Amino acid sequence: LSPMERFHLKYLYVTDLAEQNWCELQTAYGKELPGPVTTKEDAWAIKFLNILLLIPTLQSEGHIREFPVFGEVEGVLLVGVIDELHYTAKGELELAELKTRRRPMLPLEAQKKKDCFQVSLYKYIFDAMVQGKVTPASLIHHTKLCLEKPLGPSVLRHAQQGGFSVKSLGDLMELVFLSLTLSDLPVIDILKIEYIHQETATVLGTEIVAFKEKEVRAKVQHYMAYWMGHREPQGVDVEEAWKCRTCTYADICEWRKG
Ligand code: SF4
Numbered sequence: 001l002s003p004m005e006r007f008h009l010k011y012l013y014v015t016d017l018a019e020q021n022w023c024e025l026q027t028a029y030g031k032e033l034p035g036p037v038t039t040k041e042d043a044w045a046i047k048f049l050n051i052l053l054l055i056p057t058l059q060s061e062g063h064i065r066e067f068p069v070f071g072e073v074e075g076v077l078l079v080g081v082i083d084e085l086h087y088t089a090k091g092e093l094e095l096a097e098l099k100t101r102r103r104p105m106l107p108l109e110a111q112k113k114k115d116c117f118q119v120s121l122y123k124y125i126f127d128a129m130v131q132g133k134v135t136p137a138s139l140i141h142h143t144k145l146c147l148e149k150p151l152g153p154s155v156l157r158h159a160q161q162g163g164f165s166v167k168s169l170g171d172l173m174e175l176v177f178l179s180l181t182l183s184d185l186p187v188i189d190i191l192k193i194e195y196i197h198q199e200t201a202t203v204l205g206t207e208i209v210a211f212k213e214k215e216v217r218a219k220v221q222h223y224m225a226y227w228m229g230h231r232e233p234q235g236v237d238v239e240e241a242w243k244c245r246t247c248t249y250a251d252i253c254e255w256r257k258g
């Protein structure tokens with residue numbers, strides 16, 4: 001029985017893989033020992049209507065926030081939300097992820113590696129979306145969305161308020177696929193992480209992620225291999241054994257003992 005089946009998971013979040021970069025075993029324990037008026041058809045419809053509104057905003061106002069992303073990645077559906085997207089002064093599409101720290105210390109290199117992998121996943125999924133690699137069939141196969149169930153009045157409220165007339169959920173998805181791929185949306189050019197002190201608003205550092213598609217794909221194939229149940233989960237390396245000093249599951253983790 002695969003972890004996705006054991007933990008009753010049908011898709012994953014981008015942060016689930018980011019926390020998996022910190023420790024795969026700690027992430028596994030987090031899903032095993034954790035510590036309805038709307039419908040999944042309605043929730044995804046709201047996500048689609050947000051996209052249909054954000055695409056022209058980014059292409060006209062040049063700046064958007066909270067852009068949802070999704071797509072099948074190595075047999076697993078990965079879902080995420082981009083903090084910020086905007087065109088630079090040179091016409092480059094830049095992604096911004098803001099990290100606030102309560103203490104004014106520089107971020108750990110292990111924290112930077114985890115954050116670099118999170119935004120690399122954002123570009124990985126976003127680029128696949130605007131280039132026509134994410135179909136409505138792949139989402140329906142993974143989310144079990146029933147297309148003939150009519151959308152609840154909460155969504156038609158959220159919709160016609162913006163002027164658009166929705167048909168069924170299937171027609172809503174086909175317009176999203178059209179608007180993602182045929183509206184001249186480019187690939188994300190710049191991946192930018194910014195670390196800020198919460199109080200004094202001091203810049204604690206700024207990373208510009210050097211995106212390499214082959215390395216990103218290889219790391220994803222390795223991580224998704226565990227979730228599909230093809231290999232045992234791994235703990236942290238010995239040089240990063242300090243991660244278990246504060247790990248919730250350090251008292252029953254037999255990797256830290258072995
Ligand atoms: S104790 Fe260390 S190796 Fe074990 S789950 Fe926690 S962080 Fe991972």
Ligand SMILES: [Mg+2]
Pocket residue numbers: 082083097098
């Ligand atoms: Mg964010």
